[PDB]
Amino acid sequence: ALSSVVSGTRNSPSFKTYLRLKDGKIGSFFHDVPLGLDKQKRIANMVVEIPRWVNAKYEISKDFKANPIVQDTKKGKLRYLNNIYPNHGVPHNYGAFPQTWESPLESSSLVNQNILGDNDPLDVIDIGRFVSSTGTVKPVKILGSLALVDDGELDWKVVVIDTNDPFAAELNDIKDVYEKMPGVLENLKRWFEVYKIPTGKEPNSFLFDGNYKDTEFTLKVVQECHENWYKLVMGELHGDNLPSTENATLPHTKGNTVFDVEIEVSQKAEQVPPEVNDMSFIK
Amino acid sequence: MLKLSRALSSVVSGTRNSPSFKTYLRLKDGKIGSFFHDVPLGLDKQKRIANMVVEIPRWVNAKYEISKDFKANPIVQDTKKGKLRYLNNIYPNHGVPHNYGAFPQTWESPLESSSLVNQNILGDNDPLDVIDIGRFVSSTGTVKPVKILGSLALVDDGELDWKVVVIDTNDPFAAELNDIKDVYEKMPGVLENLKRWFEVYKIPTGKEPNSFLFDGNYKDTEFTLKVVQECHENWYKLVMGELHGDNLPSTENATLPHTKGNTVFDVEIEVSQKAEQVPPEVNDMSFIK
Ligand SMILES: [Mg+2]
Ligand SMILES: [Mg+2]
Numbered sequence: 212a213l214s215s216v217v218s219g220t221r222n223s224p225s226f227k228t229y230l231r232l233k234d235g236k237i238g239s240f241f242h243d244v245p246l247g248l249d250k251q252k253r254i255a256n257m258v259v260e261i262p263r264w265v266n267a268k269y270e271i272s273k274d275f276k277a278n279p280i281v282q283d284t285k286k287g288k289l290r291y292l293n294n295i296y297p298n299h300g301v302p303h304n305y306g307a308f309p310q311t312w313e314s315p316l317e318s319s320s321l322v323n324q325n326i327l328g329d330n331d332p333l334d335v336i337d338i339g340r341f342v343s344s345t346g347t348v349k350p351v352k353i354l355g356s357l358a359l360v361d362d363g364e365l366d367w368k369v370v371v372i373d374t375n376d377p378f379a380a381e382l383n384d385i386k387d388v389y390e391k392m393p394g395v396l397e398n399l400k401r402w403f404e405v406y407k408i409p410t411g412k413e414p415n416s417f418l419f420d421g422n423y424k425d426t427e428f429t430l431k432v433v434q435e436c437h438e439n440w441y442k443l444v445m446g447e448l449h450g451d452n453l454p455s456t457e458n459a460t461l462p463h464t465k466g467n468t469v470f471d472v473e474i475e476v477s478q479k480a481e482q483v484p485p486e487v488n489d490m491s492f493i494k
Numbered sequence: 495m496l497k498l499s500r501a502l503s504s505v506v507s508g509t510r511n512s513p514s515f516k517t518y519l520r521l522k523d524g525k526i527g528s529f530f531h532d533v534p535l536g537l538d539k540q541k542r543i544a545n546m547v548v549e550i551p552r553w554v555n556a557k558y559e560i561s562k563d564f565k566a567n568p569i570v571q572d573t574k575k576g577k578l579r580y581l582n583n584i585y586p587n588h589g590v591p592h593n594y595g596a597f598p599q600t601w602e603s604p605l606e607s608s609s610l611v612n613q614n615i616l617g618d619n620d621p622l623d624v625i626d627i628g629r630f631v632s633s634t635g636t637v638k639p640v641k642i643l644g645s646l647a648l649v650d651d652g653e654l655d656w657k658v659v660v661i662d663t664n665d666p667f668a669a670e671l672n673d674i675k676d677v678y679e680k681m682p683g684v685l686e687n688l689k690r691w692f693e694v695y696k697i698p699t700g701k702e703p704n705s706f707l708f709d710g711n712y713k714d715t716e717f718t719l720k721v722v723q724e725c726h727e728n729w730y731k732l733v734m735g736e737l738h739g740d741n742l743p744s745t746e747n748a749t750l751p752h753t754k755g756n757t758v759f760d761v762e763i764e765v766s767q768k769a770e771q772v773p774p775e776v777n778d779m780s781f782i783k
């Protein structure tokens with residue numbers, strides 16, 4: 212089975228999580244984890260970036276070799292998400308669909324409006340009961356989606372649940388969450404609207420009037436972004452500033468390679484800065 | 495780093511996330527005291543401050559409390575049928591939303607009805623509950639000054655369970671809060687969340703929701719000081735042996751020179767092993783309509 216390995220020191224700029232492939236070789240979280248999309252069973256594989264109730268802004272890096280998960284930084288400073296009261300850190304496990312990409316050139320057939328893709332793998336929110344570690348790859352059941360608009364880009368949020376959650380069989384479309392998990396859709400919607408306000412940013416807004424899109428519509432977003440990724444790795448797109456497509460597993464692709472990376476020994480994990488625990492109370 | 499003056503502190507006994515875990519009060523000379531009896535409440539009516547004993551740090555689930563039954567009144571995790579008790583995650587809260595604790599040298603008498611409520615309703619037999627809404631996360635067994643802001647008259651299993659809202663006096667925002675309305679206006683969602691939390695938090699354990707006096711309104715600072723005074727007065731009668739009842743708390747104490755319970759504690763500090771794992775079900779979320 213796929214697994215992961217930590218490099219460097221937790222809560223320092225050296226921290227990384229790499230994908231380990233089945234033979235022990237290093238792969239890319241972006242390119243080498245099969246999405247494993249099953250349109251019939253409405254399941255696909257998520258890469259977990261941020262465990263529920265964690266603040267560190269871990270993401271799959273498009274820049275570092277082999278696309279490890281690294282903590283975001285600004286002005287050289289590690290970035291922590293705020294506590295949007297009464298949330299502690301992220302309210303659910305946050306991650307991505309591997310082998311997907313929101314092209315900032317191919318404008319979506321699914322929105323009537325000429326709006327940009329956000330240039331990253333599709334964002335995934337796992338609302339299940341399990342707290343999942345950074346670098347976990349697991350099957351999730353696709354439920355619905357939220358069309359967040361952040362800085363002119365369509366930042367889709369796809370709501371899923373871990374297929375190991377006994378409750379997953381009780382949820383077969385996005386209205387099931389509203390009825391059976393009271394408060395989850397409302398809280399995620401408000402979180403994504405306001406989470407940058409404490410950093411000096413304006414509230415985000417929504418397409419579709421702020422309404423969640425159902426499973427059938429969401430599956431089309433996933434398929435489209437999986438096809439965009441496909442075109443990207445096959446060299447079948449013309450465009451500047453395309454992500455790296457270096458990969459360990461995709462035969463005949465230009466980026467196909469063997470990854471040679473240094474796994475740095477982990478030191479005494481640094482303290483999180485105490486100000487990370489401050490709460491943000493948003494009107 | 496280095497304190498030139500003696501201060502109260504605490505000592506952990508046993509293993510975290512195990513039935514052995516205990517935090518004891520250490521008095522200025524290093525001996526063991528009671529968190530219930532031996533921490534001066536320090537109530538200052540004019541500055542609207544008093545000392546809190548912190549039981550549960552913000553975003554912790556473990557239901558730590560001052561034990562009325564254990565010798566020297568350590569803070570211990572509530573346990574039932576030999577099973578450690580954890581508070582639920584009342585979505586979207588993670589554990590307790592703020593630092594939770596108590597006012598030492600206070601007690602809600604279960605004998606008397608308060609003269610401050612227009613209603614016959616008995617107290618909950620424990621120190622007054624305190625909720626510190628400040629930015630700092632405080633460790634179990636911390637004693638610190640807090641500014642009293644207001645209170646909520648929760649009713650739980652028929653008993654009046656006062657919740658006192660306070661802020662750590664070191665919080666730079668403390669100066670901007672002078673009464674319970676400043677929290678409502680300047681810390682949007684805090685009072686709302688606490689009130690809903692106290693209404694629903696035992697529903698996952700199979701209890702009906704709690705109710706309130708004063709129609710679920712918060713009481714202001716002036717009224718709250720009267721509740722704290724009255725509970726401090728009743729604590730005093732308890733330790734002075736002036737009350738009759740079959741299940742009064744123990745009044746054993748190290749520091750109160752004129753009390754029957756005044757004693758020297760001899761407690762064992764057990765070696766701490768590596769903290770046990772919290773059971774993974776403690777991370778499940780409760781979604782209450
Ligand atoms: Mg992302
Ligand atoms: Mg996105």
Ligand SMILES: [Mg+2]
Nearest residue numbers: 596620621623
């Ligand atoms: Mg209490």
Ligand SMILES: [Mg+2]
Nearest residue numbers: 618623655656
């Ligand atoms: Mg109480």
